[PDB]
Symmetry: D3
C-alpha cells in the first residue's frame, strides 16, 4: 500500500476509517452540543479523507489491467465509492456512511476474489 511495491494491501483500511465515519454520524444524532458537533465534524472530515486515500490506493497501486478487464465496472465502482465517501463527509446521516461502507464492501469482494486467483 506504500508504493515500493511492498505488496501488502487490505480494503480493511478503507473499511475501518469508513466505519469511524458512520460511528461519528451516529453519535452526532445523540448530542446537539455545538462544541461536540464541531469536534465530530472535524474528526469525520479527517477519517473520510483517509478512507478515500485508502480506496484510491487500492485502485492505483493494487489493481492492475487484468483486473480492469475481468471487472469492467471496477473503475466506476471505485469512482462511486469515493463520491459516496465525499457524500458521507458532507452529511450527518449515518445512512450515508453506510452507503460508502456498502461500496467498499463491493470493492472488498472483488479484492479478495483477485487474491484467490
Amino acid at each position: 500500500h506504500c508504493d515500493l511495491p511492498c505488496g501488502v494491501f487490505d480494503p480493511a483500511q478503507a473499511r475501518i476509517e469508513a466505519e469511524s465515519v458512520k460511528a461519528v454520524q451516529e453519535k452526532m444524532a445523540g448530542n446537539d452540543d455545538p462544541h461536540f458537533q464541531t469536534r465530530a465534524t472535524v474528526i469525520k472530515e479527517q477519517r473520510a479523507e483517509l478512507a478515500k486515500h485508502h480506496v484510491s490506493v487500492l485502485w492505483s497501486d493494487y489493481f492492475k489491467p487484468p483486473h480492469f478487464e475481468k471487472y469492467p465496472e471496477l473503475h466506476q465502482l471505485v469512482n462511486d465509492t469515493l463520491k459516496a465517501l465525499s457524500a458521507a463527509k458532507g452529511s450527518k446521516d449515518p445512512a450515508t456512511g453506510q452507503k460508502a461502507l456498502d461500496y467498499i464492501a463491493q470493492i472488498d469482494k472483488i479484492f479478495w476474489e483477485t487474491k484467490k486467483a
Copy 2:
C-alpha cells in the same frame, strides 16, 4: 480540491508536483554524492505522492458522471497517470517523470474542455 465542495480545481497542482519529480530525476544524474542521492530519493517519493493525490482528487472530486459519459477513456487515463507517477517514484530515469507529465497533459486538455461546456 478541499471537498467542501469549494469548486476550485486545476491540474496545474498535479503538474507542478510531477515537474518536481522529473527535475529531481534530472539532478540525480548530475551529482553522485550518496547523501545527495538519498535526499533526492526522499524528495522524489514525497512529490510523486502529492502528484498522485492531486490527480486522484480531480478524478473523484471534480469530474462528474456527464464528464465520464463524454470521455469514456477518462477513468483508464486517470489510472494510467497514477501508475505512471508510481513508476516515476520508483525510477531515477527522467523519461519516467516525462511519461507521468504527458498523461497529466492529457487530463489537463480534458479538464479545460469541461470548463467550457
Copy 3:
C-alpha cells in the same frame, strides 16, 4: 519547492489555495446549515495554512539575495501576504480572501520578472 533544490517553483500553488479560501468564504454566505458552516471552517483553515506554506517556501527557497536587493519591499510584501492569509483564515468575509489574493498577485508579478533576468 521541495528544498533539494529541484528549482521548480510557481506562485500558482499559493494562488490556487488562496482561491479555495475565498471560494469557501463565498459559500458560507450561501448556506446557514451549522454542519456546513463547520465543514467550511475546517476546510478554510487547512487551505489557508497550505497557502501560507507555499508563500513562505517561495520566500525562503526560491528568492535569493540578488532578488532582495532588486526588490527591497519583497520581505515586507511576503510578510503582509502571510498576515493577509491569517486574516482570511479568521474571517468569513470574502473581501479578506481577495486581499490575500491581491498580495499573492504582487508576489507573482515579481516572481515572473526574476524568471526573465
Copy 4:
C-alpha cells in the same frame, strides 16, 4: 481511533502497517540496487511510524483503567511493542518485523477479550 470518542478501534490498523514493514525488509534482501534500498528504507520508516501511532492510540484512547487492572502487563506490552517497531525501523532483518507483529498479536488478543465486555 480518532478521539471523539467514536469508539471504533481495531489493532488490524497497526498489524497491516507492521506487515508492510516486514514485507519491505524481505524485499530488501532481493534487490541490492542503491536507489531501491533507499526507497525501501524511506517507506519502512514511514510505515513503522504509522504502526506506532496506531499502537499508541489504542493504548491512550481505547484502553481504560479497568483494562489496565485486568491486564497488569498491558502497559509494558504496549511499550515493548513500540520499541519492537523502532527496532524494525532501524533494521533490514525481517525477524525484527516479525517480532513487532508477534507483539501486536498479543495486543490484538487482549483487545478482543475486552470487547467481549
Copy 5:
C-alpha cells in the same frame, strides 16, 4: 524525538502545545461568535493531538526499561497524561488544559532526573 535515535528529547515540546490548548480554552470564554468558537475548537483538537504525540514519543522512544524500573508509576503517569489531553480536547474548560499541563510537569521532572544519569 525523531527515532534514529538522535537522542534529542524535551517534554517542552508537549508543554508548549498543551499551553496552546489551555490558551484556546481561555479565549473561548470571551468571544461567543460561532465562527470563532468553531476555529478555536478546530485548533484545540490539532494542538491537543500534537501534545499527545510528543508525550507518546517520549514514553516509547526516550524512556527505557531502567527508567520504568526506577519509576514504577511512569507508565500510568504517561497514560493519565494522554487521557488528560483527550479530556482537554473534549472540553472548553481551561481547568482541563491546566490538568494536562500538571501531568506534563510530572513527566518533565522525571525526564530531567533521568538526564542526570
Copy 6:
C-alpha cells in the same frame, strides 16, 4: 503558534528541531552503514523542515510591524535562518546545524526582548 490567535509562541520549538538536526549530523559522522545513513537523511530532512515551519510561524504570526520597525534586520535574519536550515538539511556537517542554531539564537534573543517590552 496555531493561528487563532492563541498567543503562545516560543522559539524553543524551532530550536529543539534544529538541535535534532545537528545531533543527527553528529551521528552520521560516526557510523557509515548505508541503511543508517539513509535513515539519518530521512529524519534530518523532516526535522529541518519542521524547524523552518516554526521559524516561519514566529515571523508571520508572532512578529508585528512595530517589531519590524524596532528591528529592521529581522526580516533578513528570518530569511537567512531559513536558508541556514535548508543548508543544514542538505549537509552532513554538524557545523551547518550549529550555524542554523546560531541564527535561531539571534531570533530567540529578539523574541524574548519583545516579551519584556
